[PDB]
Amino acid sequence: DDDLVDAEGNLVENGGTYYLLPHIWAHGGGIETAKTGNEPCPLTVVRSPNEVSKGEPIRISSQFLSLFIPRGSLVALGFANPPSCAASPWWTVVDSPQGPAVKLSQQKLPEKDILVFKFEKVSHSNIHVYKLLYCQHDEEDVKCDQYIGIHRDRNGNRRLVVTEENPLELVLLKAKSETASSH
């Protein structure tokens, strides 16, 4: 398929809110926000330990003026209900001593700092299962030869950082509301 398709086989609406669960049932199930290091609050994008814990909704937008987002499109993911110290829902990759790390910022990132993602397909499958890729911009615009896998922390944290090769598979599911918050 060239477009992106979710779990109930429907097309992934552009800039729609989704749940980024994993292919295999027993791996956890929810992308979230944990406060690690000395972020004055939760900016480290993690993965809900409780399997039956859908975790937060995530806006999936592209660069195009499309009603749907086609594979190939660089994309910007982002907690539709970002934590106060954000003011930018968006995920972004900073540099840790252990390389790249998805997190939130307290300031606005330029688009070319947010729009650094790409979804890749999984062929030996039935559901539409994808593998999150990452694009480095050095000299020339895009390069998606990286990959996002899970990396654990001494505190049971499942750090979502760029990995050599142990991608995290993800089946996108539509969010059945958008009011889930703390209003």
Curated annotation (Swiss-Prot):
One of its GO terms (molecular function) is serine-type endopeptidase inhibitor activity. Disulfide bonds join 41-85, 135-144. The keyword Signal applies. The record marks 65-66 as: Reactive bond for chymotrypsin. It holds the Pfam family Kunitz_legume. The keyword Signal applies. InterPro entries: Kunitz_inhibitor_STI-like_sf, Prot_inh_Kunz-lg. It comes from the Eukaryota. Keywords: Disulfide bond, Protease inhibitor, Serine protease inhibitor, Signal. Belongs to the protease inhibitor I3 (leguminous Kunitz-type inhibitor) family. Inhibits alpha-chymotrypsin at the molar ratio of 1:2 in state of 1:1. This is Chymotrypsin inhibitor 3.
